[PDB]
Amino acid sequence: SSPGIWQLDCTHLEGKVILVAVHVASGYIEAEVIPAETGQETAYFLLKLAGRWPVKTVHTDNGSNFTSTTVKAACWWAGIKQEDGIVIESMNKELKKIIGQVRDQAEHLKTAVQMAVFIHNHKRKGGYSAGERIVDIIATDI
């Protein structure tokens, strides 16, 4: 169901990889800079996300990355269901748009990515932000 569904995606910037988790119903995001797209990086990120938010189902833009036994262990341990198939381009475009706008304010790319995550989750779209929508969606399900 809708409150526990997340989409994982990866995007490239400055010879680095940005791993993004999107809470599908709200548009709320978590993101991190990693050296390369690997099973180990995805597994560790999933384990972190699942301890912080209710993660019931995960989708990816890269099915081969979910085949990894390290990713399988993270989903098995956290009780996450892997679901095939999957917007993503637009989220990656909007995130890179925010990143480019703030890039000069920081030395490290990871700092600019976290500033971009902050801007995205706090942005009101009398409208609500993605941060307000995720908390609203999950509290309703409790």
Ligand X SMILES: Cc1nc2c(c(-c3cc(F)c4c(c3C)CCCO4)c1[C@H](OC(C)(C)C)C(=O)O)CN(C[C@H]1C[C@H]1c1ccccc1)CC2
Compute the distance between CA of residue 85 and CA of residue 58 in angstroms, rounded to an integer.
10
Nearer CB in complex with its own copies: 60/121:
121
Binding mask 5-44 for its own copies (x = CB under 8 A): -------------------------x-------------x
Cα gap 129→123, rounded to integer Å: 5
CA distances to 11, 50, 97, 116 from 106, rounded to whole Å, are 20, 29, 15, 12
For 78, counting Cβ atoms within 10 Å of its Cβ (0-12 exposed, 13-18 middle, 19+ buried), the class is middle
For the window 35-74, what string marks contact with ligand X as x by the rule CB under 6 A? Answer: -----x--xx--x---------------------xx-xxx
Give the DSSP H or E segment for 89: helix 88-102
Is 124 among the residues that bind its own copies (CB under 8 A)?
Answer: no
Helix (H, G, I), strand (E, B) or coil at 21: strand
What are the angstrom distances between the C-alpha of 69 and each of 38, 52, 87, 93, 135?
Answer: 11, 22, 28, 31, 32
Question: What is the size of the binding site for its own copies (CB under 8 A)?
Answer: 27
> Residues binding ligand X: what is the number (CB under 6 A)?
17
Taking CB under 8 A as the criterion, the residue among 38, 72, 115, 123 binding its own copies is 115
d(CA 82, CA 89): 21
Binding mask 45-84 for its own copies (x = CB under 8 A): --xx-xxxxx----------------------xx------
> Pick from its own copies, ligand X, none: which does 70 bind, CB < 5 to 8 A by kind?
ligand X
Residues in contact with ligand X by the rule CB under 6 A: 40, 43-44, 47, 69-70, 72-74, 76-77, 105-108, 111, 115
